[PDB]
Structure formats: structure tokens, C-alpha cells
Design a protein around this ligand. Structure first.
Ligand SMILES: Nc1nc2c(ncn2[C@@H]2O[C@H](COP(=O)(O)OP(=O)(O)O)[C@@H](O)[C@H]2O)c(=O)[nH]1
Ligand SMILES: Nc1nc2c(ncn2[C@@H]2O[C@H](COP(=O)(O)OP(=O)(O)O)[C@@H](O)[C@H]2O)c(=O)[nH]1
Ligand SMILES: [Mg+2]
Ligand SMILES: [Mg+2]
Lengths: 157, 162
């Protein structure tokens, strides 16, 4: 299923691949011939960063959902939270509802009540550190706050 | 730090990242970007099947490797492969590996004998390196018989690996 292209930088890995199929640290492509999931690594540092330890222990999560689709999308977050918990116990999560610009207040408050009650303080869900509602298509106050929360969480982990 | 962006397709994950950073599928399944602020290694998952695909079981136990070196730099590059091979071994003792020397077009005939000799006697059938299935020498920039043989080896081993 996966084809990993490894070796040192400048050896021709990306060039070889586009020729077979006929810098970014890690490039992930599908190759239909049987479909192979191809992982193109720039060098040793990038391969090392995929060790299961970093992948499962050293990660912080943005769980993103479309608020304009209403509280069922918040429900759609539960399977994600169980999966995230199973990858790591200690994985902190920030929930982000997008499409705020095309959401009603009934939806925003319902989703928040849902979040507050059903997701916010539960074992074994991950620790959900904050939640945000944003128009993801533009710069805004709320998006800048989300940006700061992501920084604060990365530093304090 | 890794930042893993998850959720279902079309929820705005890639749009949200682009906005945050301003400071077959229609979309890439997994996109991996560095974000300098502290550098965040950001992994943007299109959806559930893509996140699933990164389970450590699939990452470490369901992977075939193309181990690439520059043959115009000579037998020292074949030596450079040994650390890679120990590393691949540590992920799964069973990982199949195909070795490929590029830059054939700017290498000597002797360069290459030395590499093949080196590969043959130091890497080929060795407890515990991984399972080195084949080796090839190619100009990676063009179609060739040699590249077509490599393409075939990849199909063959992949199918055998399944
Ligand atoms: N002449 C020649 N140049 C090559 C060959 N393979 C790669 N290159 C050149 O090597 C350089 C590095 O290639 P790249 O594909 O970026 O290497 P990567 O870091 O391993 O992904 C590029 O300028 C390629 O065009 C080859 O077989 N022959
Ligand atoms: N109106 C609006 N559209 C959004 C928002 N976030 C994402 N979109 C749109 O949703 C569609 C899918 O976004 P994309 O980033 O591809 O979602 P992904 O599949 O989760 O990566 C695009 O047409 C975006 O412009 C938002 O907050 N408001
Ligand atoms: Mg490359
Ligand atoms: Mg996307």
C-alpha cells in the first residue's frame, strides 16, 4: 500500500518519482497503476519525524466542522474525538466551527450548548482546550484569537 | 510540534490553514507544511480515510521502500545507504527495499561497478538489514528501458507484499 522514497536531499527522489509516474519535507501522492500511496521524503530529518512516537505522542489537534450544517456536525465530531483519543491519550484538541458567516444564531448557540454539555469535560475524550467559531475565508478578530490559542497550546504542551 | 488538522471533507480545513498561515480526490489527501512562528509541522487531512491511513501499523508494517542515492558521487553514497537501511529495519524487519542509483548519465562505468560490487558484497543478503529485493541504475530525468524495469519491479514487489 505505501511506497516510501528515502535517501538524502538532492539525490533525485522527487525527479525519479515524477518520471515513474509519467523543497517540501514530505510529499504524499497517490499513484494509480493497484493504487500506491507514495510518500516522498526530503531527507533523514523528515523520515525521523514520522516515527510513531512523534506521530502519536507529539501532536496537537484542530477538529474542524461546518457550523452552517448545524448541531449534527457537532455530533459528527464524536467519532473523531474517539479516534484522536485512541492515537494518544494526552492529545489536546481545539474545536473549530467554520462557515460562521453563513450560520444562524440558533445554530451557533445550539452547537455551543452541545459542545459545552456533551464534549467538553469527558473521559475518554481528549482534553479539549478551547473552541472557536470563525469565517475561515478571511482575516478577523476570531481567527486571530484561534491563531493565538494554537501558539499558546504548542508552547504549553 | 505537529499540528494535526482533522474533520470531514469540505469542512474548511485547508482554507482555515491558509488563512491561519497568512501571517481520485479533488484535494490532496494529506498535505504536510511547516509553519514558522517555533515551527509547527502541520498535517492537513482531507478526511477520515486519510487519517486512518496514518495509523502506526500501516506506516511501519505496510510500507515498501525506494532507497535512492546519487551514483555520480560514487561508492561513498552506497555507504550513505547503510544508516538508512538500519533505520528502515527498525520500522519493520520485514520491510522490502529497492535500491536505486540515479545520475547514471553523469557517472563513470567504473563508478558503478564499484557501487554494484559494494551493494553486492555489503548490503545484499544481510541479517539485519531489511529485505533488499532489487537494485537499479537510472537517469531519473528520462524514459528508458532501465526505468521501465524499475517500474515493473515496484509493481511486482508491491503485489507480493499485499
Ligand atoms: N543528470 C541527472 N540529474 C538528475 C538525476 N536525478 C535527479 N537529477 C537532478 O538532481 C537534482 C535534485 O533532484 P531532486 O529530484 O530535487 O532530489 P531530492 O531532494 O532527492 O528530491 C535536480 O536538479 C534533478 O534534475 C539524474 O538521473 N540525472
Ligand atoms: N463561506 C465560507 N466558506 C468556507 C469557510 N471555510 C471553508 N469554506 C469553503 O468550503 C469549501 C471547502 O473548503 P476546503 O478548505 O477545501 O475544505 P476541506 O475539504 O476541509 O479542506 C471551500 O469552497 C471553502 O471556500 C467559511 O468559514 N465560510
Ligand atoms: Mg524532493
Ligand atoms: Mg482540504
Amino acid at each position: 500500500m505505501k511506497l516510501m522514497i528515502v535517501g538524502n536531499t538532492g539525490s533525485g527522489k522527487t525527479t525519479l518519482l515524477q518520471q515513474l509516474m509519467k523543497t517540501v519535507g514530505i510529499d504524499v501522492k497517490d499513484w494509480p497503476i493497484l493504487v500506491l500511496n507514495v510518500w516522498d521524503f526530503a531527507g533523514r530529518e523528515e523520515f525521523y519525524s514520522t516515527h510513531p512516537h512523534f506521530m502519536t505522542q507529539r501532536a496537537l489537534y484542530l477538529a474542524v466542522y461546518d457550523l452552517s450544517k448545524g448541531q449534527a456536525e457537532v455530533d459528527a465530531m464524536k467519532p473523531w474525538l474517539f479516534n484522536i483519543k485512541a492515537r494518544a491519550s494526552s492529545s489536546p484538541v481545539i474545536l473549530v466551527g467554520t462557515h460562521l458567516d453563513v450560520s444562524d444564531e440558533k445554530q451557533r448557540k445550539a452547537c455551543m450548548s452541545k459542545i459545552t454539555k456533551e464534549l467538553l469535560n469527558k473521559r475518554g475524550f481528549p482534553a479539549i482546550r478551547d473552541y472557536h467559531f470563525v469565517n475561515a475565508t478571511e482575516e478577523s478578530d476570531a481567527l486571530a484569537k484561534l491563531r493565538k490559542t494554537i501558539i499558546n497550546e504548542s508552547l504549553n504542551f
